[PDB]
Design a protein around this ligand. Sequence first.
Ligand SMILES: Nc1ncnc2c1ncn2[C@@H]1O[C@H](COP(=O)(O)OP(=O)(O)OP(=O)(O)O)[C@@H](O)[C@H]1O
Ligand code: NA
Length: 461
Amino acid sequence: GEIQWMRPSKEVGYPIINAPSKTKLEPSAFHYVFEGVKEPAVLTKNDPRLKTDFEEAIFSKYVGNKITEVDEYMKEAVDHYAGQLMSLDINTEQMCLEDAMYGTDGLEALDLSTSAGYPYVAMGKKKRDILNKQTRDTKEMQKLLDTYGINLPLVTYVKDELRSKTKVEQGKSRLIEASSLNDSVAMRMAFGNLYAAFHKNPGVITGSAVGCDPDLFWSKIPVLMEEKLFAFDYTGYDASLSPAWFEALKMVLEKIGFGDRVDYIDYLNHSHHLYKNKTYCVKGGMPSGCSGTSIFNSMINNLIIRTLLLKTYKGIDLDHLKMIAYGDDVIASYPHEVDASLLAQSGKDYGLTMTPADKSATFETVTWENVTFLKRFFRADEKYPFLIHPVMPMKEIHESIRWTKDPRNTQDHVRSLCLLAWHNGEEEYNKFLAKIRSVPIGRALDLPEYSTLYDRWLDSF
Ligand SMILES: Nc1ncnc2c1ncn2[C@@H]1O[C@H](COP(=O)(O)OP(=O)(O)OP(=O)(O)O)[C@@H](O)[C@H]1O
Ligand code: NA
């Protein structure tokens, strides 16, 4: 990913974008009851915490494009993956605007919360006026589509979230590249069935984990994997992607019945952005807020791992590559051990920066004891080991609970964290509940008891 040019949105007929300059994250009732070291991300150039230019930093993610064409390996990678997907018998038809707007089996309705994007964001018009569940009225949207068309600029916001002190001082705030309700709808109509098939099929055939339910899915994964697990982390995956990987992606879509509209992929690759008062053009890089960012990122990651394997181990049997990805995150396996470090090397050549799994100092042997996926670990239940516990570190929860954006969502926020934490074990969960109930706010929450959660879990399978 790389920015071709950037300039005053006025110089090209685009209005300025008002981006709130103050975070919505303030200390929560449990701020001093739990330990945390994260603070809200820098939102403006002025943040006294900054130690380098904000503009430079928030864009540093676009390290450039490393490859040009789609080589032999990539092509083979494409064939193999496209091969697997073929077996899912994916419906290639388009999705009727209605099902695409309000949802259908395999696809959730649009999220009334997220930005409507341009031009609406600048017109004040919000989704709540265009959509409206009850009737599933296509008319207003249908109208707006003809009126404003598609392939509209991406509105860019700084993501308001908790970050390390380092990523605070270094202005390393993440950015949200929001898509227009139109493009979002168009794409959902174009790929809606692809999206559905993936959500309904997390596993090693789609190589996707998108849509998955950790509480159930974790037990299925170990069975799907091969003997030897191999993993690593990406650094700026999304932004590091080069045009070639997008072309490779289209080659797959094409091979499975979507050549029809692979054009949509072109705007993810080459895209138009509006950030504040400026406008820029990016070559490469997967935008964060588009319909299908997750899935396409996962499909591409599936192409990548195959590639680096075909390029490093001539003769490698891709059919025994069992991997599951969720955007840049991934968990893979092969009958034989492989060198993560070696693969990471071939990676640089493809414009990917790969480092030891979970910020390890070095690439080490991946095991069921240390491997993570979505920050979560794998732990077989003591009483019934054939049931695997998706285990997220308590630290992650402690951090999240020390802050709040809205007091009205405290019940929901804590309840959620509880559904995550209890997997750490009864002793741990109860200490957690104890502390929560050590201040007025918590004592007023409707939190589930361990035994309740654990039994429900057992029956869920
Ligand atoms: N608006 C967004 N919302 C959600 N996720 C985003 C958004 N923008 C980018 N991302 C994701 O976050 C990633 C970057 O997160 P992060 O700042 O932690 O960088 P990192 O590469 O993980 O750093 P490190 O290599 O040191 O671990 C992107 O590659 C992309 O997957
Ligand atoms: Na882009």
